[PDB]
Amino acid sequence: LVDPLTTVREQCEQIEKCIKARERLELCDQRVSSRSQTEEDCTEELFDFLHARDHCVAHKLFNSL
Amino acid sequence: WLEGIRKWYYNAAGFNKLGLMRDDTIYEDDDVKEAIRRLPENLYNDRVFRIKRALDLTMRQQILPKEQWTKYEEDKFYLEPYLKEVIRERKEREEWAK
């Protein structure tokens, strides 16, 4: 049993807002992983990645339910 | 010079539209009602007609037509001498009281 949400989320992944958000998230990922002890936590650009993705999803998903 | 600013303010005031002279717009304090009582018959009758017409106009929210607005140079300070006399008498009484 696959979910409507996962496929809607995957289709919402490939829009340009989420593309730039994913690039910024990956940059922070490599930055924080490389540095041993830094309080810089990739929460905020993760939040923008969400804010793009969940809005894109909420515009479409309820029709699939 | 300042008279241009004065004319602009008279145009932007509003009571010229309502067909009111300047002295029709002054707040009625004790000095003012005494001066109004002191007015001659003709001036008082014209004043009350003007005020009543203005109140009618603002009740209907219709400004009086353009051409017969109270012009700046046609504005007469009829109340001013009586108000000045009233203020002078009041000031004299207060000086005597002191």
Binding site: D3, C28, T38, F47, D54, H55, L61 | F49
Partner: protein
């Protein structure tokens, strides 16, 4: 913080109402998912009848649970089958027991949960479908879980619902998103039972306001017709 999106709920319309079949399914979700940890004491099985269940179904549902109440002739607290009079069962006897049971955190009362959080259902839904993996650089203490929507970015609740977490009585798939939607709309119904009535409350009034306003105003203008047409003339000697 990251707030909730603006999901197009079926009841979000100005004069729309909740889907009662989804209310019933969400209530099933509440029974068989979170009724073991969360309490909804402010609602009773009586509220269920007439909006999501019939009288016989409500009676059977009530007797399926056991409630301890009343002192007997010997004074002991005896347990009897639940009835329509009883409110929803409380999974934990006292709140301190609940906190000590889970992690010290208290599962909030689900009766008013939707009307208490800024965002409404769109918040709670976003939380339930928002269970994510902690990002790089954020540590996780073993026992907590990461949810972007929860203030504090760390929730003390394990992922409640997922795929095939239940079996709906009707037969609709029990996938995670559908379960979240149904339980969220059921929680909206529980928080604001008058919702449907309120909408029916409004519509009539709106049509009523389409009828009294143009009349009374007209009457006013009618009664003003004397003054607005009044004409004056000055005739000094």
């Amino acid at each position: 913080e990251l707030h909730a999106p603006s999901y197009p709920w079926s009841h979000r319309g100005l004069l729309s109402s909740l889907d009662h079949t989804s209310i019933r399914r969400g209530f099933q979700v509440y029974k068989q998912v979170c009724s073991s940890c969360h309490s909804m004491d402010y609602v009773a099985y009586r509220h269920l009848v007439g909006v999501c269940y019939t009288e016989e179904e409500a009676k059977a549902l009530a007797e399926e649970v056991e409630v301890q109440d009343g002192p007997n002739e010997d004074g002991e607290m005896f347990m009897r089958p639940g009835k329509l009079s009883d409110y929803f069962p409380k999974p934990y006897p006292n709140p301190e027991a609940a906190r000590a049971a889970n992690n010290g955190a208290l599962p909030p009362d689900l009766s008013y949960i939707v009307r208490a959080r800024h965002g409404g259902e769109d918040y709670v839904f976003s939380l339930l479908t928002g269970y994510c993996e902690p990002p790089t650089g954020v540590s996780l203490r073993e026992g907590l879980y990461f949810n972007p929507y929860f203030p504090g970015q760390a929730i003390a609740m394990a992922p409640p619902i997922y795929n095939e977490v239940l079996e709906f009585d009707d037969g609709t798939p029990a996938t995670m998103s559908q379960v979240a939607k149904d339980v969220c709309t059921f929680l909206r119904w529980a928080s604001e039972p008058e919702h449907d009535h309120r909408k029916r409350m409004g519509l009539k009034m709106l049509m009523m306001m389409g009828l009294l306003l143009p009349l009374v105003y007209a009457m006013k203008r009618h009664k003003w017709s004397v003054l607005k047409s009044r004409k004056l003339a000055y005739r000094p000697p």
